[PDB]
Design a protein around this ligand. Structure first.
Ligand SMILES: Nc1nc2c(ncn2[C@@H]2O[C@H](COP(=O)(O)OP(=O)(O)OP(=O)(O)O)[C@@H](O)[C@H]2O)c(=O)[nH]1
Ligand SMILES: [Mg+2]
Lengths: 210, 19, 128, 996
């Protein structure tokens, strides 16, 4: 769509910024931590009752050394997500810093503060200690990229504030009648090879409820 | 006592079925 | 007198089950989740063609949209008594038609076995 | 292509090439954008790039190119500034000032390129941090002077001063040394008289709301640190509270200023300041009423509609009211003229509390708590707030949340308990009549009946027993009637659950009325047969919940009952639980265990125990008899499930019975460990036959569950066991035989981390009693586990975590085991500890540093013997250097405290001369040389090589401080933090380390 808003995603390395974005792009849950070098831009469309809304998600580097442009990335951003890790005390200590550097470049934009990884039981940053967002007028959400707890909420909130309609909901995208493609022998061999390899690679997280 | 026993009897009859 | 102040309308739901769908990345040689939500078997009232339509929870974005072709075969996955894996020659969930090796996992073994029964029922319907 | 031309610095920088590379990044997409990004990142990180900054500031037209230019300057100024010549420093200062002035005069540029102006200002402030006031004493006089000439400059000077205050007072703690912080703080403080004159002048005389906002933005930042007299002994409170609350652009910031005013440090005995504090509040609430909305305005509706900045404003109003009334409400409670003000402001909070917005509600709820707490303990206060509290009761009940949301529920309960106490009659009425509105159908919904149920349940214990009795009865009667009324199986399920929920929350009533309790329990058993979603869980959750509270009334014989009710449960246990899922049964058995532990007659407890375990012990006996006669039957997946369920049933009962479980453990112990071996064989067989993929299969995962549940049962009993002599002589030796070898001799992917976990608990409770048994545990698990986890920080996360817990408790309890390690393995122990430091994972890191700390204490405690001396010769400078590596590498900042403490202990040993031998090999240093001197030299050398940009003077000064301060921990920690600043820059002041 041409209804597109730039979103800067900031926060300490390892907080799950990239994981969160990838879950929204493909549906996958990346278990590996491959640190982002600089920034990656990912177009991410949502289907609302007031038409579609695209986000240019600038997934930025939390690690100092891999910082790249740093506050350069934030220029002309129309919204943001600040991420920390509720299993890591220091990631919430650094939230004031991420915010400081964000608002200096983006004076007046909607921002969501997100405490990720609430799926883990031994939680270090307690609910009652998270009060930073109050004076700075940020929306706060406990989230989990793994369990998908409140994973829609940051984008729903921003979509309402950007479009300027608090009754904007996500809705089911249109489901076209799928084709009736007959298969040919010239691609049956590679499907047969891929299938035997797939069957003998275990499905991950087999102790999960689904 | 008196109100308690007539509660107990009402509790016994509690169901999730219509019929 | 006082004056006053998705594209599934055409389809019947044969089976509705809660599941988690994966695609196989042949390059990475690992499974990748594609979505978690209700997996529906939808019979079109016009064509009588049964398709799989699966939407992700909350976002309600399609993560599976293909015909339950009579050619397909449900194979078991090595590490799961509650999953099926099969090749799909064309799926339109992402948009552009494209093939995948899907796997789909359910709450229990019994749920999976009902899926296989309903999936085969749907295959027989698609031979018209 | 042509884009990578810019990376060639041997030619002149092509500005048009840069501007399009920059354009490609900020307006481009796909591969184009991504390639441009990597070129800007390589350009920015080029150490020479700052030289080509003044070129870009002048010649380029693109504001993004100019932004990146200042970012390259920013990196030079903070890090490599003092290394420049003196002329370059003045040259750069000049064209940063000259850029800012020229952009501010041009009204076209001042309005449109705000991002670039603010960035320039921040780049200016980074220079002040290096250069002011020592080399720029006229900066403040000159800034005040320029502010007369041009309104745009005056406004931008308020942005500079805002950022200067932020960098010095709000963000100095981490980013600069203690000494340099105090310097810059003292420097602003010394000249603030002159800055405040200009501030108050602009606020009094200015018409430009853009200039006025920026001034108030600056004021907000001043109020963090300035003395109170600047606010109270001038007109400025009248201005904030009247003039600036009327206009909507200044309202937002003024309200945030008054919020911070409310927090100022003030004399608490001066009558004039009390009237002044009262006045500004009165004025602010007056403007809200006349200019924004009246007291009666439906703030819920306004917030929901989300017009302009209404949501931010209402957030800020809540913050202002709560903050001020938390501190100052005493001032309004005495004077009868201030009574209306007090209640109006509270009535605004009541309205704000109705706003549907979770995090805002939390804020207001914190205040209600503060208040109602005060009304409960403070005398002659509650009568004031009777109408406020009554409204609050309804607000809490209608917004009450499920107990699962633990923190929000706890806060709500606390407040509602206080409100129930303050007027029990009002609370009852609001609840009873809310219930009548569920019956008459006007406010009926699944959510609405649930919230009321959670609310009614929350106030248990607060009423009198008599009131509570009458109250409960009325509620339960009404709810039972509500159930009969409602049609359909969904509706009756919702109400039944709530009926059963409320009952569970009133244990006092259940203890006093046995006939009722018995009825409730028999009804739960009926609901354990219902197949409707969530009912069985509800029935079981409710059962154990009632049992935890009323457990005494199950274990004794009531009047008019043949036997204690525990017996009557045990009899029909089969029939009661037949329809349940396996894990629902385990809860039921666990609940039965709670009751049985209450019985203090040993013979009866044991009889009840074996009676309770009748079904799982008969299933067990028939499976032992079968599977021992032919190990083939274990491949039957159905049999593996049954065995796992039997063990899980035992775990469940052992969990609630602890030490009382020993007899039931006895019945199964020897056969269970024999099963652990038979299953172990099964698993090792499938891995050879089928490959590593075997471990992912259902049948092998099933078998492994048996092992883990057997280990879990043993851990659970030993963790809670009272008779430690029996644990040693009966349980341990069989356990170590069954588990240690199997673990050692399996391939890594078949090793259960639960083995390590189990052994941790064994060493914890009886480690001291089994020195030879602990040595056996190390030999079997240590080297082979270390090898699994010493290639990366990712693989085998359970094993890794449980591994460092096991070594910790050994090092605590049975340190003798590490002495008996051969020197080569003792070397791996040390390697393993330091390896734990380098982890980001908190569970490993904390234990890593703890083990090291305890190991040092253990060696100290050995005294002046050859092992402790050989430890210091071998490992002292390893621990010091490895501790320093993680302190200074910027990637273990979570572990700073334990690192600082470990490092201080290591240094203190040499300061007190607790290391007896020399730490240097012969002929390395002069002969009669203290370890203090050689410690200073080793560290001076070590740091010189690690941080070569440091001066010799810097390193020597830091270490003088650090060693002198190795008794006081917080000062030591301070000196470390100063070192972490100075390594990030060049030319740090060595005198900074004399701060303390
Ligand atoms: N348990 C749990 N782990 C998570 C969650 N989200 C992310 N992770 C883990 O966090 C790790 C790293 O996440 P990343 O997304 O790379 O973190 P990041 O903030 O992008 O890191 P940088 O790119 O360095 O900024 C991965 O190994 C994920 O498995 C979560 O919700 N729960
Ligand atoms: Mg990343």
């Amino acid at each position: 769509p041409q209804v597109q808003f730039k979103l800067v995603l900031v926060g300490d390395g390892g907080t799950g910024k990239t994981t969160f974005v990838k879950r929204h792009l493909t549906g996958e849950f990346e278990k590996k931590y491959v640190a982002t070098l600089g920034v990656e831009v990912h177009p991410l469309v949502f289907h609302t009752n007031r038409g579609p809304i695209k986000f240019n998600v600038w997934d930025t580097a939390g690690q100092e050394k891999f910082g790249g442009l740093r506050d350069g990335y934030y220029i002309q951003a129309q919204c943001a997500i600040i991420m920390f890790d509720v299993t890591s005390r220091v990631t919430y200590k650094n939230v004031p810093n991420w915010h400081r550097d964000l608002v200096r470049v983006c004076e007046n934009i909607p921002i969501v503060l997100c405490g990720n990884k609430v799926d883990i039981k031994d939680r270090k940053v307690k609910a009652k200690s998270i009060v930073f967002h109050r004076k700075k007028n940020l929306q706060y959400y406990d989230i989990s990229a793994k369990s998908n707890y409140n994973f829609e909420k940051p984008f729903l909130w921003l979509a309402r504030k950007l479009i300027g309609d608090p009754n904007l909901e996500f809705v089911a995208m249109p489901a076209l009648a799928p084709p009736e493609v007959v298969m040919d022998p010239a691609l049956a061999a590679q499907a047969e090879h891929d299938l035997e390899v797939a069957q003998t690679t275990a499905l991950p997280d087999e102790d999960d409820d689904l | 006592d008196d109100t308690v026993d007539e509660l107990t009897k009402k509790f016994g009859t509690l169901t999730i079925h219509d019929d | 007198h006082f004056e006053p102040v998705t594209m599934e309308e055409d389809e019947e739901v044969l089976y509705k089950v809660r599941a988690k769908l994966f695609r196989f990345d042949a390059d990475a040689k690992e499974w990748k989740e594609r979505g978690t939500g209700d997996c529906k078997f939808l019979k079109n009232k016009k064509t009588n063609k049964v398709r799989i339509l699966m939407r992700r929870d909350k976002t309600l974005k399609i993560c599976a949209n293909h015909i339950i072709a009579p050619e397909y075969t449900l194979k078991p996955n090595v590490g799961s008594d509650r999953s099926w894996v099969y090749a799909c020659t064309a799926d339109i969930a992402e948009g552009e038609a494209e093939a995948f090796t899907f796997a789909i996992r359910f709450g229990s073994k019994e749920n999976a076995d009902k899926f296989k029964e309903e999936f085969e029922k749907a295959q027989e319907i698609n031979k018209k | 292509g042509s884009m990578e031309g810019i990376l060639d610095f041997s030619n002149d920088l092509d500005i048009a090439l840069l501007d399009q590379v920059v354009s490609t990044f900020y307006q481009g997409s796909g591969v184009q954008q991504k390639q441009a990004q990597e070129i800007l990142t390589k350009f920015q990180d080029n150490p020479d790039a700052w030289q080509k900054a003044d070129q870009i500031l002048q010649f380029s037209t693109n504001p993004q190119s100019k932004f990146i230019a200042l970012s390259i300057l920013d990196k030079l100024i903070t890090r490599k500034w003092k290394l420049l010549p003196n002329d370059h420093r003045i040259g750069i200062r000049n064209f940063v000032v000259g850029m800012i002035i020229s952009m501010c005069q041009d009204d076209e540029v001042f309005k449109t390129q705000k991002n670039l102006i603010n960035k320039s200002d921040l780049t200016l402030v980074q220079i002040l941090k290096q250069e002011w006031p020592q080399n720029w004493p006229e900066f403040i006089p000159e800034l005040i002077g320029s502010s007369s000439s041009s309104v745009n400059v005056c406004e931008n000077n308020m942005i500079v001063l805002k950022l200067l205050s932020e960098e010095v007072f709000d963000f100095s703690a981490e980013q600069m040394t203690q000494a340099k912080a105090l310097h810059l703080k003292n420097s602003m403080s010394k000249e603030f008289e002159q800055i405040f004159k200009l501030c108050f002048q602009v606020l009094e005389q200015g018409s430009s709301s853009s200039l006025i906002v920026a001034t108030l933005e600056s004021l907000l930042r001043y109020l963090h640190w300035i003395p109170y007299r600047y606010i109270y002994e001038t007109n400025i409170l009248e201005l904030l509270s009247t003039k600036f609350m009327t206009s909507p652009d200044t309202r937002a910031i003024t309200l945030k200023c008054l919020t911070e005013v409310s927090n100022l440090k003030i004399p608490q005995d001066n009558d004039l300041i009390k009237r002044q504090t009262v006045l500004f509040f009165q004025n602010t609430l007056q403007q809200i009423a006349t200019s924004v909305m009246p007291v009666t305005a439906d703030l819920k509706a306004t917030y929901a509609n989300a017009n302009g900045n209404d949501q931010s404003f209402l957030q800020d109003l809540a913050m202002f009211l709560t903050t001020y009334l938390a501190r100052n409400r005493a001032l309004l409670e005495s004077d009868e003229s201030l009574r209306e003000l007090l209640l109006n402001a509270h009535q605004y909070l009541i309205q704000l509390s109705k706003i549907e917005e979770r995090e805002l509600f939390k804020t207001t709820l914190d205040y209600w708590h503060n208040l109602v707490a005060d009304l409960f303990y403070e005398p002659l206060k509650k009568h004031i707030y009777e109408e406020i509290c009554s409204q609050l009761r309804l607000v809490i009940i209608e917004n009450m949340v499920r107990p699962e949301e633990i923190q929000l529920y706890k806060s709500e309960r606390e407040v509602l308990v206080y409100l129930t106490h303050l007027n029990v009659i009002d609370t009852e009425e609001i609840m009873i009549s809310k219930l009548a509105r569920q019956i008459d159908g006007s406010e009926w919904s699944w959510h609405n009946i649930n919230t009321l149920s959670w609310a009614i349940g929350s106030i248990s214990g607060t009423m009198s027993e008599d009131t509570e009795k009458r109250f409960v009865v009325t509620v339960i009667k009404d709810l039972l009637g509500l159930c009969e009324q409602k049609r359909g199986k969904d509706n009756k399920a919702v109400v039944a659950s709530d009926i059963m929920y409320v009952v569970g929350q009133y244990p006092r009533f259940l203890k006093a009325h046995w006939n009722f309790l018995r009825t409730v329990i028999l009804k739960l058993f009926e609901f354990m047969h219902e197949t409707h979603e969530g009912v069985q869980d509800m029935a079981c959750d409710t059962f154990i919940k009632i049992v935890q509270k009323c457990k005494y009334h199950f274990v004794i014989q009531q009047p008019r009952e043949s036997e204690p009710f525990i017996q009557t449960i045990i009899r029909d246990i089969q029939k009661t639980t037949a329809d349940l899922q396996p894990q629902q049964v385990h809860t039921f058995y666990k609940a039965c265990g709670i009751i049985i532990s209450e019985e203090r007659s040993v013979a009866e407890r044991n009889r009840l125990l074996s009676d309770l375990m009748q079904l799982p012990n008969m299933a067990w006996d028939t499976i032992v008899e079968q599977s021992t006669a032919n190990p083939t039957l274990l491949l039957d997946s159905e049999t593996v499930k049954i065995i796992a369920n039997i063990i899980k049933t035992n775990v469940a009962v052992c969990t609630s019975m602890g030490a009382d479980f020993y007899p039931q453990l006895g019945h199964i112990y020897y056969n269970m460990l024999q099963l652990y071996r038979a299953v172990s064989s099964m698993i090792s067989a499938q891995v050879a036959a089928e490959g590593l993929i075997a471990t992912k299969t259902p049948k092998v995962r099933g078998l492994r569950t048996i092992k883990k549940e057997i280990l879990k049962l043993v851990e659970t009993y030993i963790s809670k066991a009272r008779n430690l002599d029996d644990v040693v002589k009966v349980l341990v030796e069989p356990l170590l035989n069954a588990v240690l070898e199997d673990y050692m001799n399996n391939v890594p992917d078949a090793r259960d981390a639960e083995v390590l976990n189990c052994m941790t608990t064994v060493v914890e409770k009886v480690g001291h009693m089994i020195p030879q048994g602990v040595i056996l545990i190390l030999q079997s698990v240590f080297e082979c586990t270390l090898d699994m986890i010493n290639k990366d920080f990712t693989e085998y996360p359970e094993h890794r975590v449980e591994f460092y817990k096991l070594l910790k408790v050994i090092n605590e309890k049975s340190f003798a085991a590490f002495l008996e390690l051969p020197p080569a393995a003792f070397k791996l122990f040390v390697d393993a500890i330091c390896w734990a430091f380098k982890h980001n994972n908190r569970d490993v890191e904390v234990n890593g540093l703890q083990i090291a700390l305890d190991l040092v204490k253990n060696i100290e405690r050995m005294g002046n013997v050859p092992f402790a001396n050989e430890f210091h010769k071998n490992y002292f400078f390893i621990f010091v250097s490895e501790t320093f590596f993680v302190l200074t590498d910027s990637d273990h900042k979570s572990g700073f405290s334990k690192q600082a403490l470990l490092l201080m202990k290591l240094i203190s040993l040499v300061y007190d001369n607790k290391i007896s031998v020399p730490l240097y090999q012969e002929a390395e240093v002069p002969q009669g040389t203290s370890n203090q001197v050689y410690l200073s030299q080793y560290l001076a050398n070590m740091l010189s090589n690690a941080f070569p940009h440091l001066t010799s003077e810097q390193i020597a000064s830091f270490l003088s401080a650090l060693t002198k301060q190795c008794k006081d921990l917080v000062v030591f920690k301070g000196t470390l933090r100063d070192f972490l600043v100075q390594i990030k820059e060049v030319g740090g002041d060595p005198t900074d380390y004399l701060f303390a």
